[PDB]
Amino acid sequence: MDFNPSEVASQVTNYIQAIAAAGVGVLALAIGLSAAWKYAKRFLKG
Amino acid sequence: MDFNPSEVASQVTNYIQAIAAAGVGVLALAIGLSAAWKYAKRFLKG
Amino acid sequence: MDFNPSEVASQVTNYIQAIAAAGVGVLALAIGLSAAWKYAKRFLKG
Amino acid sequence: MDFNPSEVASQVTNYIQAIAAAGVGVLALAIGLSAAWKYAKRFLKG
Amino acid sequence: MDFNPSEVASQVTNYIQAIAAAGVGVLALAIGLSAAWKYAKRFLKG
Amino acid sequence: MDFNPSEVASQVTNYIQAIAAAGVGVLALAIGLSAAWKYAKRFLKG
Amino acid sequence: MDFNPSEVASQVTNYIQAIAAAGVGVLALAIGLSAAWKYAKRFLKG
Amino acid sequence: MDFNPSEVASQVTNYIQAIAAAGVGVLALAIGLSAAWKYAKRFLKG
Amino acid sequence: MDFNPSEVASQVTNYIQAIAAAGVGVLALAIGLSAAWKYAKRFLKG
Amino acid sequence: MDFNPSEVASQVTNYIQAIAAAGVGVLALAIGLSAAWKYAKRFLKG
Amino acid sequence: MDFNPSEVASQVTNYIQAIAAAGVGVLALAIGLSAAWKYAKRFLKG
Amino acid sequence: MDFNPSEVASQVTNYIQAIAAAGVGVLALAIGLSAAWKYAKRFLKG
Amino acid sequence: MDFNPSEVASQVTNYIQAIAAAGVGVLALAIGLSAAWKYAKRFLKG
Amino acid sequence: MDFNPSEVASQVTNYIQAIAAAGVGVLALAIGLSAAWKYAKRFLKG
Amino acid sequence: MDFNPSEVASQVTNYIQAIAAAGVGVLALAIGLSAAWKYAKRFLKG
Amino acid sequence: MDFNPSEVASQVTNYIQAIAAAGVGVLALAIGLSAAWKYAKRFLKG
Amino acid sequence: MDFNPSEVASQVTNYIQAIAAAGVGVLALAIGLSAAWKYAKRFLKG
Amino acid sequence: MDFNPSEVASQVTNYIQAIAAAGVGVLALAIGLSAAWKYAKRFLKG
Amino acid sequence: MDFNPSEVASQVTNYIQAIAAAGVGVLALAIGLSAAWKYAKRFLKG
Amino acid sequence: MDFNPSEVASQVTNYIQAIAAAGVGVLALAIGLSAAWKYAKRFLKG
Amino acid sequence: MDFNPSEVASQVTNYIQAIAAAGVGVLALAIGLSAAWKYAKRFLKG
Amino acid sequence: MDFNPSEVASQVTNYIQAIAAAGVGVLALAIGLSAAWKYAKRFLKG
Amino acid sequence: MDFNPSEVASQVTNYIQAIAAAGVGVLALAIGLSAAWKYAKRFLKG
Amino acid sequence: MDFNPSEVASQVTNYIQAIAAAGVGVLALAIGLSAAWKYAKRFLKG
Amino acid sequence: MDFNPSEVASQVTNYIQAIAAAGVGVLALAIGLSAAWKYAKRFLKG
Amino acid sequence: MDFNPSEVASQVTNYIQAIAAAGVGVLALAIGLSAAWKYAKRFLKG
Amino acid sequence: MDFNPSEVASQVTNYIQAIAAAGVGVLALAIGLSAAWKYAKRFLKG
Amino acid sequence: MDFNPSEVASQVTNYIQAIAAAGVGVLALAIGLSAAWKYAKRFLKG
Amino acid sequence: MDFNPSEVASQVTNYIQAIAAAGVGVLALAIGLSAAWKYAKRFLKG
Amino acid sequence: MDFNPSEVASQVTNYIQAIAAAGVGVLALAIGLSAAWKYAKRFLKG
Amino acid sequence: MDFNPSEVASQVTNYIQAIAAAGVGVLALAIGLSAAWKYAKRFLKG
Amino acid sequence: MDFNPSEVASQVTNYIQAIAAAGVGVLALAIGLSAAWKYAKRFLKG
Amino acid sequence: MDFNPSEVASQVTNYIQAIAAAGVGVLALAIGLSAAWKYAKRFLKG
Amino acid sequence: MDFNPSEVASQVTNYIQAIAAAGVGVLALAIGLSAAWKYAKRFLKG
Amino acid sequence: MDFNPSEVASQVTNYIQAIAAAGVGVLALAIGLSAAWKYAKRFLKG
């Protein structure tokens, strides 16, 4: 069993598409907000 | 999840239309008034 | 357990809606005031 | 402890009501005076 | 004993709720203050 | 598999064209507005 | 008994699905929080 | 010893009440003065 | 007596279930803690 | 004597409760201080 | 019987193809995961 | 009686199939575990 | 049989070309992403 | 050493009493003069 | 006397229960400690 | 075979010229952009 | 790939010619107007 | 000797009280000065 | 081969002369422009 | 590339000769007019 | 003499209590110091 | 090679004499002009 | 050597008394001048 | 090298004596003229 | 018959060429694999 | 000889008091300087 | 050889006196200039 | 026959030149790759 | 033959001069590049 | 041969003087430049 | 003579007390040093 | 000869004093340098 | 002949002085290099 | 014939000088190589 | 003659005191060295 460990490269990688997103990916709703958060202060700052 | 963070550009931006207005936008009622406020003093100043 | 860490993206994000607000969000009562604070000085300044 | 940092928005904000006043707020006694100060010179200026 | 190490995930995690708070969590009383601290200087700065 | 990791340089980079835009790119509608936001206050300021 | 040690590959592997999760897996509730923990400080930091 | 690091949140925080004041806090005697300092120049400026 | 030494495979193996746990198994209470121990330092580190 | 090595799991583990604390645990008095140490510099930095 | 022990080289070797896989081979499902496990922590770590 | 000692080669060999397994063979349930035992420590170690 | 073990150097090595790739190689799709993942946060960070 | 940084608030502040005066303070001899300077031109201007 | 040497299997075996323990068995008090010994260095190492 | 492992230094190194480029190298199209990305915000910021 | 990142200096720079213009450049139609805006008020002011 | 490493938590910690002060602690004489340093420039800046 | 790694100091360094320029170096055409960009707004601002 | 950024001083400066003129320079046709504009009112005012 | 080798388990074990301490045990005075050593550099690092 | 990095202080510094001039230095031809630019408007303004 | 790093707080601090002065301190001869520089223009401006 | 940065206070300051003059200093020939410029208009204005 | 036993040295030796190979010789297909087996774990381990 | 290896704990530990100092300890003369080094740049930076 | 590594603390430290100066130290000729550079623009700015 | 066994030293040794290479020798193509494998991850890691 | 094995120390050692170089030695062309690789990102990062 | 391995301390150490320089040492020509690189952007930034 | 061989157990055992020490026992002076040797490198490593 | 092997403990140990130094001991001249090497980059890094 | 075998202890031992050196002894030229080899990578790694 | 068997001690012994070498003696060319073989893997391993 | 063979026990035994030493006894000079030989490699290995 050697073809096994390669086909597996498919096993980390499918676990990763959304995952890589968890900090960066759902967060864009709150994170752009860090940007949106800027405007929060400038209307105040202008 | 990568299409996520772009679609999100829609999330800061919709939070911004009125917001950008808060200092400049409701204030035009009181701010033009800073202008209107000028006349306040000139009828007095003329 | 891999579906776990994604469903979790729901765990930072729900902690964030008000939170992101704490500096920008309650503060708009005092912060616009930084703007309102402007007028404080102009009636004096005009 | 996450509800903590929001309830706290109450902690900057209560520190701010008078505070925001310190430069603008007690000063209106002396500052309007900057205005009152105008008249000081005009009776002289008229 | 293998079910042991998983049930344990409960052992770090219960040690963490307040803990994660210690720097961010009690500190919001002093930290928002870093924000509140801003106003400290602006009434002075305006 | 070594030609793989280079061809991949194509994988971050295609994820980036719009992305790099998200803060700077959709925002130019609201951001120029930060500029447009200037005029907001000057007609008031002039 | 030689088919034994292979069928066994099933014995480490079933012990692993949740297990691999214990540090990474339950922790995403507290760990994303390390991320969520970021926001903790920025509303303060902005 | 885990209850230790939380009870400690009490250790940074008690070190902070006056401390946060050092730049903003004693300074209000000299800093409002930056404001008071304004008047210094206006009686001269009026 | 030859069936003896096989039936015995049952004798090491029953001695092993908890045993294998001793370093890894009770320790997950203290070990996850090595993980929990991380958070110990980050609230401090953030 | 085989029940011995398991009962022993009790021997590392009781040696560990405070111990795990030594770097993280007494140190929270000085370590939060690394955090408290932050404020040290900001009142200076603000 | 001497050709016997060589033909036998076929007897260890056929017992080995999957076997060699047992730790490395089924495990790639959980092991790449040790890699996949990395990403677990970075979305959190980024 | 000389054909006897050869036919006997059948007598050690049938005693051996499971036997050879006793240390390696039942143990794969606990031994892979030595491998599974690895993961025990890494979720802790990661 | 001695030429055997050398010709075999061909047997590990052919098992290795893709294999060496499994962590580094398929992953460049997700890994550059760790890089691509950077941009995820900067449009937010800029 | 934590009482140190507060007692120090005494160190900027004592450096400030005259200092704050340097532009506004010695200058009142020349600055009122900017006022006195007015009269310079009016006896000429009347 | 032939039943003698078998009944005797009882004579090595009863000498062995604790004995097998001597290196592994009392030592678990000091040996887990080799494990406990790990923590000794990590609180220092973390 | 010893001259082999040196001639091989040629084998990592030829795999590296473009590779080293993958994060830094294709990315300069998107990365300078991080710089170009600056200007994105300043025309807005000026 | 090293000549790549330099040739790229061409990639930010071509993105910049008009861009640098966006706030300053289209705006001269409205901005000179800030100047033109002056005259707006002087015919009124003269 | 296990009570040793805990009692020792007393050994880093006593080395730390002043130490933590060295950059933040003696420096408040020069650092507030960074603040005091501000005033240096404003009497000049007002 | 030890004289190799030093002679190589010549290999990063020759890759650097223009490179260091890429952000600062081609950009001076657009960057001074950030300065030139100032004038853009002042003729408007004067 | 270091001689680059100096030769560039030529790039802002050539963009400036007419530019500096835009508000002051074309405007002298309309601006002297602000002066010419005086006469507009005096023939009326005399 | 068979009870001998067990009673002896008492002979390694009594040699071990302090001994196990020698690297970990006296060293906590210098080792926590490796931790204390951290602070050495941070007051410098902050 | 340690005398190297000091002799080098000569390498940034020689790159700096004109350079520091680029914004301030060639620009004095156009910048004093910002001053000269004043007069542009006053002959108009007087 | 631990008393060393504290006694050293004396080493940055003695390097600082004049130093802190270099920008603010010798410059008061030229900087008040920025103030003195004001008068330069007002006798002209009055 | 620490006495260096102080002796240097001599390096900005010698660059400043005439420099501070450039706008205020050569200009007094043209600037008093702004005053002289007054008379230009009054002989006309009287 | 004495030349017999020497000519026979040919009889063990011809039985040995492949034979010596059986453990080392066919096994290089599976054994290098023990080496190849290394890589199995490192792509996972890197 | 067993009391030997413990008494020896005295042999690493006496080698350590100054030693632990070498990087952290003499260096505080140059390292605080890294801090002192800060001020180097701020008088320049203020 | 143990007295060696301490006496050596003398070897980094003597390499450091000027070195620490290289960025901060020769640069004060050009850096104060960053300050001197200020005046460059103000005579222009006043 | 005694000169035989020495001349034979030639028989293991000629079997060894390539052989010693099999794990280390062909593998340098894949092994340097373990090194080359590093770069795989750093372009990703940088 | 005993002088043989020493003269041989010459046999590993001559195989080593370049060899030791293979990872460190040819690689300095690509490795300094890991350093050169830094600059890759900073011109982008500055 | 034991005096050999010490005299050798001379063999790593002579390989190190320039070597240690390769990243830090030739690079000071390009690295101070990272500092020199600062000025690149400030004349632009001032 | 049979009591002889037992009384003799006293003859190996008295030869052993120091002896067992020779590698472990005198060596603790140099061996802890292997530990002490650690610190050798960390002050360097920290 | 039994007193021989103990007196010998003197033979490894005298071979060790400098020896233990070879990697750690002469190297402190180059190794502290790894520390000194830090400063190499920070004057550049500050 | 019995004095023979002792005098002989002189025969292994004289064969050993250099010999023991062959792996450790000539190799220190290449081996310290394994240490020297470290630096190879750090100038690259720093 | 009795002097015969002693003179013969010369007959095994002369057959032995090279012979003893055959495994250890020619092999040092390939065996040191087992050592040299180490380096084979470390340049790869470093 | 029977007392003869016992008195003789004195004849093997006196031949043995040094003899037993020959392999173990003179060799401790070279053998501890096998231990001393360890250190040979670790200063290299650390």
Neighbours of AI35 (CB within 10 A): 23
Q: List chain AI gaps (C–N > 2.5 A) by preceding residue.
A: none
Contacts for H41-45: CB closer than 8 Å, 24+ residues apart: H41/N24, H41/N31, H41/R46, H42/D34, H42/D37, H43/D37, H43/N32, H43/N35, H44/N28, H44/N31, H44/N32, H44/N34, H44/N35, H45/N34
Q: How far is CA AH28 from its chain centroid?
A: 8
E-assigned strands of chain AA? none
Residues from chain C contacting residue B41 (CB–CB below 8 Å): 46
CATH number, domain D1-46, options 3.40.50.720, 2.130.10.10, 1.20.5.80, 3.50.50.60: 1.20.5.80
Report the C-alpha dihedral over residues B3, B5, B11, B16, rounded to 10 degrees: -130
Report whether S33 contacts Q22 (CB < 8 A). no
Residue J26, CA distances (Å) to H7, I37, I41, N39, U30 in order:
11, 13, 12, 71, 16
- Return the partners of chain S (3 or more C-beta pairs < 8 Å): P, Q, T, V, AC, AD, AG
**CA-wise closest residue to AB43 among Q1, AD24, AG43, A22:** Q1
Q: Would you call E43 helix, strand, or coil by DSSP?
A: helix
H7-35 as b/e: b if 16+ CB within 10 A: ebbebbbebbebbbbbbbbbbbebbbbbb
Which residues of chain U lie closer than 8 angstroms to AE42, CB-CB? 34, 37
**What would you measure as the largest C-alpha separation in chain W, in angstroms?**
66
Angle between helices I9-21 and L28-45 (to 10 degrees): 10
- Best mutation target among L3, L8, L39 (most K Cβ atoms within 10 Å) is L39
* CA-based nearest residue in chain K for residue L28: K22
Angle between helices AF9-21 and AI28-45 (to 10 degrees): 20
Q: Which residues contact Q13 (CB under 8 A, 6 or more apart)?
A: P36, S26, S27, S29, S30
**Phi, psi of F2, rounded to the nearest 5 degrees:** -125, -35
Q: Which of P25, AG39, P2, P5 is nearest to AB33 (CA)?
A: P5
DSSP Q6-33: HHTHHHHHHHHHHHHHIIIIITHHHHHH
Of the candidates H18, H30, H43, the beta carbon closest to that of N13 is on H30
Q: Which are the contacts of V3, defined by CB distance < 8 A and separation ≥ 6? A: none
Q: How far apart are CA K20 and CA A41, in angstroms?
A: 62
From residue B39, alpha-carbon distances to M7, X22, Y37 in Å are 99, 41, 88
C-alpha distance from I18 to closest chain G C-alpha (Å):
14
AC20, two tokens: 């030791």
Radius of gyration of chain X (CA): 20
| Test mutation, P38, P41, P44, P45, chain S, max S CBs within 10 A | P38
Residues 6+ apart with CB under 8 A from V2: AA15, AA19, AD21, AD25, AF33, AF36
> Helices (H), strands (E): how many in chain R?
3, 0
Using the structure block, give the residue that is written with the tokens 């309830």.
D7
Q: Return the structure tokens found at Y37.
A: 């087996």
Cα–Cα dist AD11/AD19, whole Å:
13
Domain boundaries, chain AI: 1-46
User: Helix F9-21 crosses helix M28-45 at what angle (to 10 degrees)?
Assistant: 20
For J28, which residue in chain E has the nearest alpha carbon?
Answer: E22
Residue W35: alpha-carbon gap to chain centroid? 16
> From start to end of chain AH, where are the E strands?
none
- Give the H/E segment covering residue R25: none
- By three-state DSSP, how is residue E27 classified? coil
Measured between beta carbons, which residues in chain P are less than 8 angstroms from residue F17?
A: 30
Distance CA D41, CA H46 (A): 8
Q: How many Å apart are CA S12 and CA S3, to the nearest integer?
A: 16
Q: AE39: burial class by Cβ within 10 Å (0-12, 13-18, 19+)?
A: buried
Q: What is the DSSP string of C1-46?
A: --HHHHHTHHHHHHHHHHHHHIIIIITHHHHHHHHHHHHHHHHHH-
Structure tokens at C4: 């776990």
Q: What angle do CA M33, M38, M43 make, to 5 degrees?
A: 125
Amino acid identity of W42?
R
CB AF20 within 8 A of CB AI43: yes
Structure tokens at S20: 């260091």
Handedness of CA J20, J23, J29, J34 (dihedral sign): negative
Question: Which has the closest alpha carbon to Y30: O46, H19, AI5, K19?
Answer: K19
Gap between the Cα atoms of V1 and AG39, Å rounded: 14
Chain R residue with minimal CA distance to O34?
A: R2
CA distance AB4 to chain Y (A): 13
Identify which of V22, V30, V41 has the shortest CB distance to residue S46. Answer: V41
* Neighbouring chains to AB with at least 3 Cβ pairs closer than 8 Å: F, M, P, Y, AC, AH
* Residues AD25, AD28, AD34: CA angle, nearest 5 degrees: 145
Of AF16, AF28, AF31, the CB nearest to AE30: AF16
C-alpha pair distances (Å), AG30 with each of O10, Q3, Q9, AC21? 59, 37, 44, 11
CB atoms near residue AG4 (< 10 Å): 7
| Local structure of Y35: helix, strand or coil | helix
> What is the rounded CA–CA span in Å between residue AG39 and residue AD16?
7
Structure-block tokens of residue E32: 């928002």
Q: In angstroms, what is the C-alpha Rg of chain U?
A: 20
Sign of CA dihedral AB33, AB36, AB38, AB40: negative
**Residue AI25 CA, distance from chain mean position:** 3
What is the rounded distance in angstroms from the CA atom of residue M26 to the CA atom of residue M19? 10
Torsion angles phi and psi, residue J41, rounded to 5? -75, -30
Nearest one of S45, I21, X22, M27 to J12, comparing CA atoms: I21
Contact residues, chain Z, for W23 at CB < 8 Å:
42-46
Q: Do AF37 and AD16 touch (CB under 8 A)?
A: no
Of Q13, Q24, Q28, the CB nearest to S26: Q13
Nearest residue in S to T3, CA atom: S25
Q: Are E26 and I45 in contact (CB under 8 A)?
A: no
Q: What angle do CA K9, K10, K16 make, to 5 degrees?
A: 95
Mutate to test the interface with AF, among AG7, AG16, AG31, AG39 (most CBs of AF within 10 A): AG39
CA distance M38 to R34: 35
Resolution (Å units): 2.4
Would you say the C-alpha torsion P35, P39, P40, P42 has a positive or negative sign? positive
Chain centroid to Cα I21, Å, comes to 3
Helix segments in M1-46, DSSP class H: 3-7, 9-21, 28-45
3-state per-residue secondary structure call for chain Z: CCHHHHHCHHHHHHHHHHHHHHHHHHCHHHHHHHHHHHHHHHHHHC
| Distance separating alpha carbons of residues S35 and V22, to the nearest angstrom | 10
Name the helix (H) or strand (E) containing M2.
none
CB contact under 8 A, M27 and A13: yes
CB contacts < 8 Å between T and AD, how many?
A: 4
Q: Sort out which chain AF residues have CB atoms less than 8 A from AI46's CB and list them.
A: 23-24
Chain Q residues within an 8 Å CB radius of F46: 34, 37-38, 40-41
- Residue with the two structure tokens 């007015």: N38
Burial of residue AH39, with CB atoms counted within 10 A of its CB: 0-12 exposed, 13-18 middle, 19 or more buried: buried
Residue type, AD9: A
Alpha-carbon gap, residue A41 to E35, rounded angstroms:
12
Q: What is the full DSSP assignment across B1-46?
A: --HHHHHTHHHHHHHHHHHHHIIIIITHHHHHHHHHHHHHHHHHH-
> Residue U5 has which token pair?
């080798």
Residue with token string 């002796």:
X7
Q: Which among AB32, AB42, AB46 is the nearest to AC22, CB-wise?
A: AB32
Picking from H41, U13, M32, F38, the residue whose alpha carbon sits closest to that of residue N34 is H41
Nearest-Cα residue of chain E relative to residue L40: E5
